[PDB]
TrEMBL record, chain A:
SUPFAM superfamilies on file: Ribosomal protein L14 (SSF50193)
Protein's recorded name: Large ribosomal subunit protein uL14
Source species of the chain: Mycobacterium tuberculosis
Annotated Gene Ontology cellular component terms: cytosolic large ribosomal subunit
Single GO MF annotation: large ribosomal subunit rRNA binding
UniProtKB/TrEMBL annotation, chain B:
Shown stretch of the complete protein: 43 to 135 of 135
Subunit architecture: Part of the 30S ribosomal subunit.
The name this protein goes by in its record: Small ribosomal subunit protein uS17
Any one GO molecular function term: structural constituent of ribosome
Function: One of the primary rRNA binding proteins, it binds specifically to the 5'-end of 16S ribosomal RNA.
UniProtKB/TrEMBL annotation, chain C:
Origin species: Mycobacterium tuberculosis
Family statement: Belongs to the bacterial ribosomal protein bS16 family.
TM region(s), chain numbering: none
Part of the intact protein present: 2 to 92 of 162
Keyword Protein biosynthesis (UniProt): no
Gene: rpsP
GO CC annotation terms, alphabetical: cytoplasm; small ribosomal subunit
Coiled-coil ranges (or none): none
Keyword Repeat on entry: no
Name this protein carries in UniProt: Small ribosomal subunit protein bS16
One MF term in the entry's GO annotations: structural constituent of ribosome
GO biological process, one term: translation
Keyword terms, alphabetized: Ribonucleoprotein, Ribosomal protein
UniProtKB/TrEMBL annotation, chain D:
Keywords linked to the UniProt accession: Ribonucleoprotein, Ribosomal protein, RNA-binding, rRNA-binding
GO biological-process terms attached to the record: translation
Gene Ontology MF: a single term: small ribosomal subunit rRNA binding
GO cellular component terms attached to this protein's record: cytosol; small ribosomal subunit
Biological function: Binds directly to 16S ribosomal RNA.
Region ranges (Disordered): 1-21
Protein name per UniProt: Small ribosomal subunit protein bS20
Length: 121, 93, 91, 82
RNA sequence: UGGAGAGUUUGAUCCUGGCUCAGGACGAACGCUGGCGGCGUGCUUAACACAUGCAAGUCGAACGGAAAGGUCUCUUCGGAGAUACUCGAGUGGCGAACGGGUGAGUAACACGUGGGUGAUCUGCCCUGCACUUCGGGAUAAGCCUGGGAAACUGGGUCUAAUACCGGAUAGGACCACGGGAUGCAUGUCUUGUGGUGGAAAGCGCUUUAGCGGUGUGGGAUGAGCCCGCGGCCUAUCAGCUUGUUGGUGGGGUGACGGCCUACCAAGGCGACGACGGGUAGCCGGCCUGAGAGGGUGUCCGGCCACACUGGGACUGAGAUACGGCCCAGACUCCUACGGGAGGCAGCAGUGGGGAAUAUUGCACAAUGGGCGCAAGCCUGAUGCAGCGACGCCGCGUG
RNA sequence: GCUCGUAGGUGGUUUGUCGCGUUGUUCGUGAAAUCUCACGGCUUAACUGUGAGCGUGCGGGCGAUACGGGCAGACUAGAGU
């Protein structure tokens, strides 16, 4: 995931698709994986929803098509790139998470999202 | 009764009768008959005439334009048929 | 099953009851099949009124009255007449 | 609620009625395939076997006497017209 | 047996013609004031969401067993004994489809009305004709284990039945052939002939304690289905339909029917308004009006539709199946993250909205309903009580 | 603005038939409460019980053809040639 990438929103804030604007975590950081924070803009939303089109938001990546290594030598790979819109205190703005999430959120300290998720892999 | 009682007599029901002209007959054993009636207006009190349309069963389809027919109403023989042919009176001129 | 039941149609402190024949699966104060009398439990002894022949017909056809209608039928003697018991009147 | 017993009796009824109905269906299709085969010899006894099974089911109450009569008439006319 | 007018155009007049008023009514609210009793009425807005308690259980005179009661029982001196009334739980039977709630949806044979059912079903009720006759296999419960945080569940034994299955015989099951009457065309009601077949169950008894079940005739009751007539606005909605219209052969239904299916015809609906849009539960009823009419569907009564939203099946005589089940969605909650539970448009009550509408009360004393042979049990139906001048009536404040 | 004309509404005199409209009687139905007459009971009324009206209608049978109407005819006045 880099700038101009589009992701599917995995919560119920009303936004459907967001476009990555900046990968936070340092100057000229290139790729955002699972557990990384993203500044993004809402490119689509449910009509008459809480979040509108064009709002600049902050989100955390929870699913990636690209497979990611784990310290024990195993890998995990999803079928889509998905993110969750969060508050400044790392809590999701939505009330529930759709679909599974990666276990790296535990080590990135996203306990609220981890608890809300249907499944952690 | 040392055996089964057959039944008690009852008066059989009487079905309505109407007379009308045959309007459409190309129906493959069915005919379409126009019926008319008069009902007094609820408010103005004038007598007015209204024409209806019913579908009548014709086992042997012999009826043309006109062909006045008296109809007696039956069970639901079809989806939209509730009448059967009784007899042909005052054939088409 | 057909039952003969008391129907109350009085005011709050005047519980007047009507001896009526009604279906069992109906409310108490409902449209009975046929009313065959009444009963006022506010006179000195009581006020009892029974047709005594429509009740007989219903009893012979299968109608089954409740406990108070049964007591009233026994009082009026129509139940005794239907069942063949000797005393046809005990008012 | 005291309806768990009702639910258990219900499911017992589903299994019983479904089994008898499926057996009756199999007998009916056996008679039907005999009818199209047109042996006209073992179909005569298959008709009686199907009638016995179907009115036994009707007596058991799993079906109605009207349905039993309809099916028996249908299978009889089926044997008849060939 | 019941019909009021007044003001207001002008320098003054008569018409036409608007606008306003005097009257009544309400499931009412507000302002002020405020004693009581009789009877009624009280979420009209958010079919918005709900903490909590009660709203459907019963039968030991169907059955296996004994958790408790008093118990004769051995006796522990605090433990024993189903054989005994009695009965936890369990099998089985019935009820649970009634009763209670809302008016959301619905312009519809939903409702009111009158016909048809030769197109029909129908437990418990009544009652005519007869039976109530033989065998088999497992299981609940209990016991021994296992899994799961729970919700729940597996393996092994084990005991019945008015539980289940298999039997002998029984015409309103069928087929073919006929007789006898009927018309309203398919037909209708009853016997005969030959070929087919279809159930029952036992239990209790102070010895006339009583209950039962089925094979079917006929009533009573409830309901399924069709038809004519009547009850909104809109054409700045003019063309609608293809299982649609009909027929044939099958399938399906308790029952007729494109209800479903395969084939054939091209038909069916529309200016008397289809199709489309807006609105709405219908009626008996209620208000006003001399009446015709205009408004309205609240108490109550009849019906219909719905039960968080949407869809579906089963049991059963009978299911929108509120307090039954399966699935999809949203919401709420528990969790060990693997998984589970839930629906006050029942009574009472809470949160929120609104100008605004009530107790988490009593009792089955009477009526109705359900379970037995009963005695008896349940019933927020019901009978009441509590709050409000909320409405009618009546009496006082001499 | 005028005219024509589709459906529709409406229609001269006279005869016969039907009796659909019309009208009469009878039967069934038109639930109860509530609306009214007359009574009865809460000290009265409100409230409630009873008898009769209401339920304007509908279905069935049995009477009439005076008018409208269906059918079968006839006339010339309408109208047309
Ligand atoms: Mg046909
Ligand atoms: Mg098979
Ligand atoms: Mg059939
Ligand atoms: Mg004036
Ligand atoms: Mg002047
Ligand atoms: Mg002037
Ligand atoms: Mg004038
Ligand atoms: Mg039980
Ligand atoms: Mg017990
Ligand atoms: Mg019983
Ligand atoms: Mg039941
Ligand atoms: Mg119910
Ligand atoms: Mg409401
Ligand atoms: Mg509604
Ligand atoms: Mg109707
Ligand atoms: Mg076992
Ligand atoms: Mg036999
Ligand atoms: Mg048996
Ligand atoms: Mg087809
Ligand atoms: Mg067909
Ligand atoms: Mg509505
Ligand atoms: Mg006037
Ligand atoms: Mg619904
Ligand atoms: Mg709710
Ligand atoms: Mg639903
Ligand atoms: Mg049942
Ligand atoms: Mg069933
Ligand atoms: Mg449902
Ligand atoms: Mg229920
Ligand atoms: Mg509920
Ligand atoms: Mg409530
Ligand atoms: Mg407010
Ligand atoms: Mg408020
Ligand atoms: Mg009680
Ligand atoms: Mg009682
Ligand atoms: Mg006030
Ligand atoms: Mg002009
Ligand atoms: Mg002009
Ligand atoms: Mg002009
Ligand atoms: Mg013309
Ligand atoms: Mg003309
Ligand atoms: Mg004339
Ligand atoms: Mg004319
Ligand atoms: Mg008095
Ligand atoms: Mg009346
Ligand atoms: Mg008549
Ligand atoms: Mg001339």
């Amino acid at each position: 995931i880099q700038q101009e990438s589009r992701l599917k929103v995995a919560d119920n804030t009303g936004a459907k698709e967001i476009l990555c604007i900046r990968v936070l975590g340092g100057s000229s950081r290139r790729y955002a994986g699972i557990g990384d924070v993203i500044v993004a803009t809402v490119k689509d939303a449910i009509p008459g929803g809480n979040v509108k089109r064009g709002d600049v938001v902050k989100a955390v990546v929870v699913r990636t098509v690209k497979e990611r290594r784990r310290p024990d030598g195993s890998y995990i790979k999803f079928d889509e790139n998905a993110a969750v819109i969060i508050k400044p205190d790392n809590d999701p703005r939505g009330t529930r998470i759709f679909g599974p999430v990666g276990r790296e959120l535990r080590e990135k300290r996203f306990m609220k999202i981890i608890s809300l998720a249907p499944e952690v892999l | 009764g040392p055996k089964h009682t057959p039944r008690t007599p009852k008066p059989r029901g009487r079905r309505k009768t109407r007379i009308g002209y045959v309007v459409s007959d190309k129906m493959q054993k069915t005919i379409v008959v126009e019926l008319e009636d008069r009902m007094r207006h609820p408010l103005y009190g004038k007598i007015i005439r209204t024409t209806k349309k019913v579908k009548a069963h014709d086992e042997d389809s012999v009826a043309g334009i006109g062909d006045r027919v008296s109809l007696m109403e039956t069970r639901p023989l079809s989806a939209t048929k509730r009448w059967r042919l009784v007899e042909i009176l005052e054939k088409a001129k | 099953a057909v039952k003969i039941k008391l129907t109350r149609l009085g005011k709050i402190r005047n519980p007047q009851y009507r001896v009526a024949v009604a279906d069992a699966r109906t409310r108490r104060d409902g449209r009975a099949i046929e009313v065959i009398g009444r009963y006022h439990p506010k006179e000195e002894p009581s006020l009892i009124e029974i047709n005594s022949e429509r009740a007989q017909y219903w009893l012979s056809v299968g109608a089954q009255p409740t406990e108070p209608v049964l007591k009233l039928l026994k009082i009026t003697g129509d139940w005794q007449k239907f069942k063949g018991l000797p005393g046809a009147q005990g008012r | 609620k005291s309806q768990q017993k009702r639910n258990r009796t219900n499911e017992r009824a589903r299994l019983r009625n479904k089994a008898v109905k499926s057996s009756l269906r199999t007998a009916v299709r056996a008679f039907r395939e005999a009818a199209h085969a047109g042996d006209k010899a073992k179909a005569a006894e298959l008709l009686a076997s199907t009638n016995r099974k179907l009115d036994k089911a009707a007596s058991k109450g799993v079906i109605h006497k009207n349905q039993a009569a309809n099916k028996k008439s249908a299978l009889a006319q089926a044997l008849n017209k060939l």
